[PDB]
Amino acid sequence: PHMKWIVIDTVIQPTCGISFSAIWGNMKMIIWYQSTIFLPPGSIFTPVKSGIILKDKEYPITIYHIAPFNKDLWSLLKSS
Amino acid sequence: TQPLVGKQILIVEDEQVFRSLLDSWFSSLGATTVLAADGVDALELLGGFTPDLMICDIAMPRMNGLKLLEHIRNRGDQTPVLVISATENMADIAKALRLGVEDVLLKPVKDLNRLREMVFACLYPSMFNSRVEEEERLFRDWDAMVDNPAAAAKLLQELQPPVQQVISHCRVNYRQLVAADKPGLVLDIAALSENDLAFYCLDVTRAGHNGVLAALLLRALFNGLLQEQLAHQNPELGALLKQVNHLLRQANLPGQFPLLVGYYHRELKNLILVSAGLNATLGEQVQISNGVPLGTLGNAYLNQLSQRCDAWQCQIWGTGGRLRLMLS
Incomplete structure (x- = not known):
């Protein structure tokens, strides 16, 4: 078995170099991570210590912030 | 039941x-x-x-x-x-x-x-919303050992604006003397229009890594937020400060967030400034009120000021840094 988390949506800010992704695991979360990894909406992946297995490839994900999902904050991100 | x-x-x-x-x-x-x-x-x-x-x-x-x-x-x-x-x-x-x-x-x-x-x-x-409160606590503890504060600090340092730049045909210079490369006092300057310019100043040494995150979030959205408050007008920076407090609340960014927010209109030769936490002074001199940092007091509910000058020199300092900002 392996956890199957799904990216509900993602926003990338050019002002910064950050990717904000709302994802579902066992609950909704917002992750602020490095833009280098691109996670389009609908992507299913397995989390790992400082990494993500997507399509059987382990990408090193640099995480800035992990927080519970907020409808207001996510809508604010999507409006930029 | x-x-x-x-x-x-x-x-x-x-x-x-x-x-x-x-x-x-x-x-x-x-x-x-x-x-x-x-x-x-x-x-x-x-x-x-x-x-x-x-x-x-x-x-x-x-x-x-x-x-x-x-x-x-x-x-x-x-x-x-x-x-x-x-x-x-x-x-x-x-x-x-x-x-x-x-x-x-x-x-x-x-x-x-x-x-x-x-x-x-x-x-x-x-x-x-007890669930939301519990989850906030959980994610605050969670973030500590999954996130890389060093990478966020480095990114914030890299994103800082140039020392000298012209924005909204306003000359703008800034010089910091506290130890650089360890992100402390942080600034952002944006153009709201061909004549409107705005900026924010945050001492990220008080909130720690969250502060860095806050700073980043600010650079993502500050412009936008200010523009929204300018949408319903023909100013009112305080509402922007409270909205920023609520943003940091929506994200899981607790702690104290000493902030300063300024807005200069070139053709109106007017500078408006509000401070919640940060000391500062600026001329014709006026010392900006210290204020109560954001994330605390619920709502700072602080004042503004209009000097109606063409060029200004404002020094902004807090427990984590000292900086000078200049408009000619």
């Missing part, structure tokens, strides 16, 4: 045993339940009456439960919809989550207590 008294609840499930289980669980809690066995029947029931909460299964429906969600959102009813699926159709769960759904449950019914948790959280979100 009597928790769900007067709670109209719609259950759109296709397997009869699961229908009965859900109805018995909801009626045990006192809910007024309406059950459908078909997607079209679901659409009709919806056109008929408005349930306080809805449950739909996209598993073997006559009409895709995700398509029923699509219809509901197209109508804009935006009624709650808790979906039922399994470890399969991960993409369907994604599509549901993109729709205005609330949570998800695996087809087996084993964890009824988590079902009670989700149903109550949906039906009385204000009452059961």
